[PDB]
Amino acid sequence: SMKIFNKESLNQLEKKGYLIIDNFLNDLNKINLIYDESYNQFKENKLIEAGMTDKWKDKSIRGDYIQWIHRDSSTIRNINYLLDKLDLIKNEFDNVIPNFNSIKTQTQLAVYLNGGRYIKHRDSFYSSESLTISRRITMIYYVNKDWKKGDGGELRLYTNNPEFIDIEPIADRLLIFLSPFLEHEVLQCNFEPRIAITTWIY
Ligand SMILES: O=C(O)CNC(=O)C(=O)O
Ligand code: NI
Ligand code: NI
């Protein structure tokens, strides 16, 4: 079923701060197309190094190649399909939590190569571009086919929601967690490419 939030799951998200949904699409043919289209974006020089050699601005902080996808004759049709599915989750957030009132979404396609990592951080921030907080909910969809237990690249999610747990970035896995509260980091990658599609709900 495509409804994510029932009595228990909502309580887990509010208490534990995260929620893991495996076999989100459960469509192998589509998963492979999302992988291919995501990989082609990198091959076609459509990504950018997030950490860019200026001081404290290099691959020490984060070493992935990212692209910001603007969302509502296309090369990323199947990626857009996933993003639409993720948009339905946002709709469910608004319908189940009365005062959530989503403002907008922000999407990032990220590719890590061998040896890539992302130091501890939280996704939420406050900048002059908006009066209020940015990024309340984080939704990460992994597309790494045939990931084994030694390839690294796991997401280390620190369970401290006002100890950690290593989440394997296996294909078709959807990770949801509260952006302002859960600290996390990407452990070093021993395989390539590590593909992850994130949609933040503001
Ligand atoms: O890709 C992941 O698993 C984790 N990504 C992030 O934390 C990020 O882009 O801010
Ligand atoms: Ni279901
Ligand atoms: Ni993050």
The C-alpha atoms of residue 119 and residue 108 are separated, in whole angstroms, by 17
Cβ atoms of 171 and 32 closer than 8 Å: no
Query: What is the b/e burial string over 2-41, where b = at least 16 CB atoms within 10 angstroms of the residue's CB?
Result: eebbeeeeeeebeebbbbeeeebbeeeeebebbbebbeeb
Annotated binding residue 27:
no
Burial class from Cβ neighbours inside 10 Å (0-12, 13-18, 19+) for residue 89 reads buried
The three-class DSSP label of residue 20 is: strand
Pocket test for ligand 1, best of 38, 48, 117, 123 (most atoms within 8 A of CB): 123
Give the pairing of strands 184-186 and 105-112. unpaired
Q: Which residues line ligand 1 (CB under 6 A)?
A: 110, 118, 123, 140, 155, 184, 186, 196, 198
In the chain, what are the domain boundaries? 1-202
Annotated binding residue 77:
no
What experimental approach yielded this model? Answer: X-ray
Between the CA of 3 and the centroid of ligand 2 the distance, in Å, is 6
The C-alpha atoms of residue 88 and residue 65 are separated, in whole angstroms, by 27
The C-alpha atoms of residue 138 and residue 141 are separated, in whole angstroms, by 10
The strand pairing partners of 140, in sequence order, are 175, 198
Q: Nominal resolution in Å?
A: 2.0
